[PDB]
RNA sequence: CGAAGGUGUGCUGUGAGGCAUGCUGGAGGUAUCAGAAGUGCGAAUGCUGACAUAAGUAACGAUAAAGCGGGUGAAAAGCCCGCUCGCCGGAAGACCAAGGGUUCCUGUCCAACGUUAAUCGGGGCAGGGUGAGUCGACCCCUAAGGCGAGGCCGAAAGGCGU
RNA sequence: AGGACCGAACCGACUAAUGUUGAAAAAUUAGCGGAUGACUUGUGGCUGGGGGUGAAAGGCCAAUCAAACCGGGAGAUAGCU
RNA sequence: CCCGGCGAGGGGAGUGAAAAAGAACCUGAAACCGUGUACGUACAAGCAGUGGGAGCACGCUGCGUGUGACUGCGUACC
RNA sequence: GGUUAAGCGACUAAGCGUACACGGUGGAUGCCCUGGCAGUCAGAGGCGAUGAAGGACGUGCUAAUCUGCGAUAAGCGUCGG
């Protein structure tokens, strides 16, 4: 249920070795607007694959 | 005459932790663990001041045996022959000669063989 | 010419902000600003403000470089934690620590 | 065990699921563009496209089926009067899902669902 | 022209120690020989404060339920407006006594508090709001009981009682 | 008529599951007993610790009961740890 | 003056002997948590040290500081 | 020099260890005294129905608290400094 011995800094770090975050590999550039966006996601201005399909 | 203990306690703890430098984890960081690590290190150092002499005698004897068997005689026969010939060269210098001057070791072996024969 | 930016007493544990600080250490500011924008973490909103401040500080206090800047140092230090009481079953009070962190970013062209 | 099964539970019971998709289909037919979660849009496809397909042949029986599945006479009227004639030459694919980032409150993936020719 | 205190290094004695000097500190320290002790901590399931581990793990408090559009906003799953949906309805609705005390309404702010975010709030700040011959209290009457001039009783205190 | 019967409110607490760092220092759900009486309930009053009260279980007397709690004798005593 | 939400927080400028005295303010120890550099470590079994000891890195003119592959011995304190 | 075979074989660090440098946290140490403790030498040994000890409420250019004060309310008269 509970420890008998305090685990160490070392074992803490080894357990945390798989906690690293994977940064975004590469952002896609819009062909019309040239904005950077996540692939298959629309741009902040509302573009996607060169077309402005967003009301705003 | 109230006496505060901060300065002297810090001095003693820093002394022990300074001796505990290089150890692993709490042995190097925490005073309670470090103190019985430092005492254990001193006990081992006392013991190994004695054990060092045994280990080096063992090493010299092994090297002398190797060189003697190279020259065609056992270690026991070689030392007995040196004793009969009254050669008082110790085993440290015999091992040094075995490593660094093989001609001299052959000379010593022939002296021991003459002593035995 | 190093330029510092500091956010002290951020409402986020150092362990939480360090996962994001690990993503932009030794990296071009333009590249570091893109990574932060697309990482679904609350630490990244907090770390993108210190980085942006540091660029602005490099613009205004130091010489106008911007394009030649890199994240030369970044670290997170534990800050003062706040102590609160969480009641539990059968009348036992637990102490919850609300942790804080100081974020430091250092940018230089060299 | 989910071998060859269809439909997402979406952490709801079946009654809540039916009611939610009824409301959401009404909203999509009304506005022609709605922001929702990605899996919700994936299921709204299956809810809304059969309804528009039903809105091709204009008959009282189809009107009553649509009203049974929608419970909104304005939505039924808009379907049979506008979206039937609009999509009458299209073989399915009346809708379009565009992924649009994440929700601030809970980091849920977000998608716009649109009717393929809305012109707004 | 750098004291105590902190932190390193070098030397030094058999040991507790001593000495010197770099950095920090910014004002006191104190030889020698005597004198006096709250005079030496690693443990007492010791006392107090800080900080770890378990671990970014369990949990986020009734399984009545939510979806979308617009608005404000630095930012909206949660705030506002609207439409649909769902729950209670001898209650999860309305009103009193008791208890509380400003939680009431408006404007503003989001550090902390709210088991998340928060533009919202019973949160912070400021200003406003409680109008009685007829409602209630007070008031006049008394019940159980209390207190009780004289009085009876009891070492004192005090008990009982007209 | 009834210390009658079935059964809501109300008063209780027989069984099971849950929960046991609980939503809760005794509860939740499903069932369960009484339910015009030796009933239940509000407001106020009285009984005080070798005492009270007790359809009596050493039960209850402010989450404390084979002698409440607070303060004192008091740094009781401890041939024990 | 600049970043930011007319925020919190910070970077400059200025005061001051000192801001490494900025109000979470004299000094600022330890536990505890990090960033950087040097060596070591992914075929290796145990109170983690001690004796021997290569290599490597950095100072000095074959040593000094750091790490410590491999190896003998070695089951904490009260 | 070319091909093959055999033998040997440096450089990896997801993380971790040790050393050093620089930081965070934290609040010990040093220095300080407007607070205490124990006394000595002198006082005084009481206040109150002429309403006390102690309080509530109020009192300012005042929003609150402390101090003083009391509807003559951070105060009024007189006499000296």
Curated annotation (Swiss-Prot), chain B:
Keyword Ribosomal protein listed: yes
Protein origin, superkingdom: Bacteria
UniProt xrefs under PROSITE patterns: RIBOSOMAL_L20 (PS00937)
CDD domains: Ribosomal_L20
GO terms under cellular component: cytoplasm; cytosol; cytosolic large ribosomal subunit
Keyword Metal-binding: no
InterPro entries per the UniProt record, alphabetical: Ribosomal_bL20 (IPR005813), RIBOSOMAL_L20_CS (IPR049946), Ribosomal_protein_bL20_C (IPR035566)
GO molecular function: large ribosomal subunit rRNA binding; mRNA binding; mRNA regulatory element binding translation repressor activity; structural constituent of ribosome
Complex formation: Part of the 50S ribosomal subunit. Contacts L21.
Function text: One of the primary rRNA binding proteins, it binds close to the 5'-end of the 23S rRNA. It is important during the early stages of 50S assembly.
Xref: HAMAP family: Ribosomal_bL20 (MF_00382)
Family from the record: Belongs to the bacterial ribosomal protein bL20 family.
Name of this protein: Large ribosomal subunit protein bL20
Gene assigned in the entry: rplT
UniProtKB/Swiss-Prot annotation, chain C:
Gene Ontology MF term list: large ribosomal subunit rRNA binding; structural constituent of ribosome
Gene Ontology biological process terms from the UniProt entry: assembly of large subunit precursor of preribosome; cytoplasmic translation; cytosolic ribosome assembly; response to antibiotic; ribosome assembly; translation
Signal peptide from the UniProt entry: none
Keyword rRNA-binding recorded: yes
Binding sites annotated in the UniProt record for L-tryptophan: 90
Pfam families: Ribosomal_L22 (PF00237)
Domain of life: Bacteria
SUPFAM superfamilies in alphabetical order: Ribosomal protein L22 (SSF54843)
GO CC terms: cytoplasm; cytosol; cytosolic large ribosomal subunit; large ribosomal subunit
Classification via CDD domains: Ribosomal_L22
Keywords: Antibiotic resistance, Ribonucleoprotein, Ribosomal protein, RNA-binding, rRNA-binding
Family: Belongs to the universal ribosomal protein uL22 family.
Purpose: This protein binds specifically to 23S rRNA; its binding is stimulated by other ribosomal proteins, e.g. uL4, bL17, and bL20. It is important during the early stages of 50S assembly. It makes multiple contacts with different domains of the 23S rRNA in the assembled 50S subunit and ribosome.
Additional detail: The wild-type allele (erythromycin sensitive) is dominant over the resistant allele, and is also dominant over the temperature-sensitive allele at both low and high temperatures.
Assembly, per entry: Part of the 50S ribosomal subunit. In TnaC-stalled ribosomes forms part of the binding pocket for L-Trp with the leader peptide and uL4.
Protein name (Swiss-Prot/TrEMBL): Large ribosomal subunit protein uL22
Organism the protein comes from: Escherichia coli (strain K12)
């Amino acid at each position: 249920a509970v420890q008998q011995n305090k685990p160490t800094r070392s074992k803490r770090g080894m357990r945390r070795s798989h906690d690293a975050l994977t940064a975004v590999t590469s952002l896609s550039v819009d062909k019309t607007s040239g904005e950077k966006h996540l692939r298959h996601h629309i741009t902040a201005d509302g573009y996607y694959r060169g077309r402005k399909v967003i009301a705003k | 005459a109230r006496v505060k203990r901060g300065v002297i306690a810090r001095a003693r703890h820093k002394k022990i932790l300074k001796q505990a430098k290089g150890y692993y984890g709490a042995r190097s960081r925490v005073y309670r663990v470090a103190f019985q690590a430092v005492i254990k290190a001193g006990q081992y150092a006392y013991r190994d001041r004695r054990q060092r002499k045994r280990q080096f005698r063992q090493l010299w004897i092994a090297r002398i045996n190797a060189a003697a068997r190279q020259n065609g005689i056992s270690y026991s026969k070689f030392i007995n022959g040196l004793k009969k010939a009254s050669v008082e060269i110790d085993r440290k210098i015999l091992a040094d000669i075995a490593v660094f001057d093989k001609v001299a070791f052959t000379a010593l072996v022939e002296k021991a063989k003459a002593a035995l024969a | 010419m190093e330029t510092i930016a500091k956010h002290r007493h951020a409402r986020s544990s150092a362990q939480k902000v360090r996962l994001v600080a690990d993503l932009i250490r030794g990296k071009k500011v333009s590249q570091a600003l893109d990574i932060l924008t697309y990482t679904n973490k609350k630490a990244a909103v907090l770390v993108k403000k210190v980085l942006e401040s540091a660029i602005a500080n490099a613009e205004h206090n130091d010489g106008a470089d911007i394009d030649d800047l890199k994240v030369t140092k970044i670290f997170v230090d534990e800050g003062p934690s706040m102590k609160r009481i969480m009641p539990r079953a059968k009348g036992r009070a637990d102490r919850i620590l609300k942790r804080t962190s100081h974020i430091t970013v250092v940018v230089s062209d060299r | 065990m989910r071998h060859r099964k269809s439909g997402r539970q979406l952490n709801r019971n079946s009654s809540h699921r039916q009611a939610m998709f009824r409301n959401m289909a009404g909203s999509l037919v009304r506005h022609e563009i709605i922001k929702t979660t990605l899996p919700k849009a994936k299921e709204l496809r299956r809810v809304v496209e059969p309804l528009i397909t039903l809105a091709k042949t204009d008959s009282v029986a189809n009107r009553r089926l649509a009203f049974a599945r929608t419970r909104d006479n304005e939505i039924v009227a808009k379907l049979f009067n506008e979206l039937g004639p609009r999509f009458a030459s299209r073989a399915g694919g009346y809708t379009r899902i565009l992924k649009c980032g994440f929700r601030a409150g809970d980091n849920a993936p977000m998608a716009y669902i649109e009717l393929v020719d809305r012109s707004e």
